[model samples]
Target: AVPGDMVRIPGGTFLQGSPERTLDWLDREGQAFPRDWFTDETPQIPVTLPDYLIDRHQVTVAQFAAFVSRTGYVTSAERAGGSMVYGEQYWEIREGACWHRPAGYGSGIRGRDDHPVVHISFADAEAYARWAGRRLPTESEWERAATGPSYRLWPWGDTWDSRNANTAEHTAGALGDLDAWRTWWGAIHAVQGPMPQTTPVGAFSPRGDSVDGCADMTGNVYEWTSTLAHLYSPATRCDPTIHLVMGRSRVIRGGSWMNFRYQVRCAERLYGDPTGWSNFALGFRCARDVTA
Candidate 1:
């Protein structure tokens, strides 16, 4: 319950990601983030945030269940028939696979009352936040909480150590367990801890605290923000990469339990198909901005 206690962030300008675009840090820490992590958070820039609210912890299975009981909001996972299930975790989809009955029928959030709710799409997250009279944090707001006013790679700092947070790096596969194509030590770390799944919230306060005193802003689950999932040049002078289609993936920030340490950084930004769902360790936190 402590993790759910909302931490209000005063809106202002903050550096969202590392100023370095090079993969030097990712290289040193192994891959605590997505493949091609550098490109995802390239050209770290200052973002202006508007006032808003965010969940202290990710929407847990228990909380999400309550929303289902009220509005019967159908999650994309349920509607899609099946959210992408990781490794061996199984939850078959049925005709009524909505948020209430995530992963079809006969399946529910049986034991994970505290774990972040997975199998949710961007739309699904918005619906629940709306139900509770809140909204997903904007990209800038989300980053402000994660990286804080000082973007130093992680909410904690630049050092990549297990004591800082639970990244996929420590448990990555043993030295030789890397893929034939890549010799990534972090990959082994990812496989070891949590066994390719999410962990309880506030499980690593020793390592996950932001400079701004925000919890779960760097690790635990990849959160959905209200930002339109598209590439935008930092509010600066630079050539922007414009997407002609404008159907860019939704913006998911923070890192998942399944991700490496590099990913747990507050400034990290990831893109994914807004329509698709993944139980591969995606969840969200809510925030409430202080207007005063």
Candidate 2:
């Protein structure tokens, strides 16, 4: 029912992020990220990744459905009212707003069964990975696949080119291809592109296939990983707890459509409530077991 594409990651060390980036673009954005956010990105934190196989694409709805079919499992979205609805749109808590009904009534997965699945919480993402013969990638592993050894600005590389993935890049300094989008008229209040919504897996192949051979590491959706939320905390230990049932928040790397192109940098990472779910802008891909 679902097709899978995998990328093998060659483990190595690369500078995660330039400290100047925080003092540059990140600080101006509002402190949604903790100081430690920059800390992890700083002073060239060495990440030694072990050999691992990563899905070349984010997990898709059809693949998720197959997991459900075999496990007879219900997802967190299935149990909760609905995925988080954003944008100054007034909305009350919606009932029955799970993945099966991502946006609510009248909405369902259509021509996108093969596209990366959305409306899943980190927990729901975990459940699916467990059911399949896979697991989430570690934060370091994900980045290695994204930027490889290049320390490229994005999955593709150094320039903050918005066309690489969907986000608000048409601004003056924010800079996107103006004539191509014809968005010179105004700011991009919503995600841009003909594939503005989700596109099917591997469709973006030639664009982000790093030297490590990974695809869509940026701009698809933030992927949940086994790392703990506080891995950035200087006080933390390297052997942090690795699973959700342990009760600590998990690490989410990569950014989504609702975020700026900067946030999707391979080394860029985010943390959120483990049981938390984002509407259609966040999801995951799985990792093949690799010895550390």
Candidate 2's C-alpha lDDT? 0.64
lDDT of 2 by residue, 190-227 (tens): 32211325556666677655666666677766678877
What are the per-residue Cα lDDT tens digits for candidate 1 across 23-119? 5656665555433435545556667776445555678888888888888676777556665543223333334444444444555556767777877
List the pairs of residues colliding in candidate 2. 77-98, 81-97
lDDT, candidates in the order shown: 0.62, 0.64
Task: Look at candidate 2 and tell me the lDDT of residue 15.
Answer: 65
